[PDB]
Amino acid sequence: STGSATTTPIDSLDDAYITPVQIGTPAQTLNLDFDTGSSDLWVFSSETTASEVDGQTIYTPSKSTTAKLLSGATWSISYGDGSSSSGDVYTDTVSVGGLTVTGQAVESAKKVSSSFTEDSTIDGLLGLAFSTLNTVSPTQQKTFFDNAKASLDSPVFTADLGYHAPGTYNFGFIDTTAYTGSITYTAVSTKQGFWEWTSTGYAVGSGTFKSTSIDGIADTGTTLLYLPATVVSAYWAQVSGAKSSSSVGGYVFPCSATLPSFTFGVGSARIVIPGDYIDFGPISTGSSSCFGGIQSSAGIGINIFGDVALKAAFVVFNGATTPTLGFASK
Numbered sequence: 001s002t003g004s005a006t007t008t009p010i011d012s013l014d015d016a017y018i019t020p021v022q023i024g025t026p027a028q029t030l031n032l033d034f035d036t037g038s039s040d041l042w043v044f045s046s047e048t049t050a051s052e053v054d055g056q057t058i059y060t061p062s063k064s065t066t067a068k069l070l071s072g073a074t075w076s077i078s079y080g081d082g083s084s085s086s087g088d089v090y091t092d093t094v095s096v097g098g099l100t101v102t103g104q105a106v107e108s109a110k111k112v113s114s115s116f117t118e119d120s121t122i123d124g125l126l127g128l129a130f131s132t133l134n135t136v137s138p139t140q141q142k143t144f145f146d147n148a149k150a151s152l153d154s155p156v157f158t159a160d161l162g163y164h165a166p167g168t169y170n171f172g173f174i175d176t177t178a179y180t181g182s183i184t185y186t187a188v189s190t191k192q193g194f195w196e197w198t199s200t201g202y203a204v205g206s207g208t209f210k211s212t213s214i215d216g217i218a219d220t221g222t223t224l225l226y227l228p229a230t231v232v233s234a235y236w237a238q239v240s241g242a243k244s245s246s247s248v249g250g251y252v253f254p255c256s257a258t259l260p261s262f263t264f265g266v267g268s269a270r271i272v273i274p275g276d277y278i279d280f281g282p283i284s285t286g287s288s289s290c291f292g293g294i295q296s297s298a299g300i301g302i303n304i305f306g307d308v309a310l311k312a313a314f315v316v317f318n319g320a321t322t323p324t325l326g327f328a329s330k
């Protein structure tokens with residue numbers, strides 16, 4: 001089997017991407033944030049505290065003939081931006097882009113934090129990291145990808161995110177029309193439950209490439225590119241007037257600037273992030289200070305190749321027995 005679904009930015013800055021997902025019988029379509037940095041499929045639901053729902057589409061398990069309470073199971077997750085959610089669990093039929101998993105754990109939110117409530121366009125998350133991070137207790141549950149894997153033509157999924165445009169998540173096949181040149185594969189460590197890999201270095205704009213190992217995760221659920229302070233300082237030093245602002249919470253730059261590109265290494269290959277991809281616009285409406293799309297990972301504890309980096313590439317998440325990651329230009 002295979003699946004193919006379009007993923008669409010939620011706003012003009014590509015702050016996140018949503019992908020339609022069919023849950024239950026008859027289908028209830030919710031728009032989920034596909035997150036290769038976590039491993040819970042959770043949704044706004046008929047059980048979510050009413051005051052915490054503001055425009056989201058909800059899953060109602062009582063209206064699904066295939067829904068079954070997973071008795072005694074609960075979940076609770078805290079994300080790296082300080083957001084959180086928790087609730088109980090149903091199993092139901094879940095389909096993505098034509099690919100169907102029966103008996104998928106669908107985690108029904110009873111509580112969500114304010115940042116979820118405030119984002120009316122995101123109806124929940126679909127985790128695509130390794131199932132060892134799944135928070136369901138007392139019986140840990142598998143991700144949609146892990147459940148689908150054995151049925152897929154090939155044990156892979158791909159992320160092809162757009163810059164200010166829709167893109168695609170494919171399951172079970174590599175679309176050879178969706179990228180240019182060849183795909184470079186690189187080793188993955190699953191020790192922390194993430195798609196964790198080591199970049200071979202970077203360049204700023206037209207500058208020379210610096211060979212240096214940068215361990216980090218491929219995380220479609222993180223908006224920005226978070227890298228070591230040394231690397232980030234070298235980038236922003238090439239932008240007149242850029243500075244790190246503790247009051248704003250990161251690097252800002254004059255909105256009048258033309259940003260340089262940023263290149264990262266994948267083995268001997270190179271992925272170029274155009275300068276425009278690094279512009280996240282005014283810090284507040286009408287401001288002439290703009291927020292940077294490359295930020296320091298210091299204090300996070302891990303480097304994160306988020307959407308700013310991933311959308312510059314066609315990315316293969318290879319879930320073979322020894323997982324790997326592939327990157328191609330596009």
Ligand SMILES: O=C([C@@H]1CCCNC1)N1CCCCC1
Binds near residue numbers: 035038078079221
């Ligand atoms: O919570 C997260 C991210 C949040 C955004 C969505 N992807 C998962 N983590 C990844 C980075 C290290 C801390 C854990």
Ligand SMILES: O=C([C@H]1CCCNC1)N1CCCCC1
Binds near residue numbers: 080222249300
């Ligand atoms: O929002 C944040 C951090 C970055 C700034 C310091 N506190 C919040 N991140 C995005 C999600 C993955 C971890 C990094």
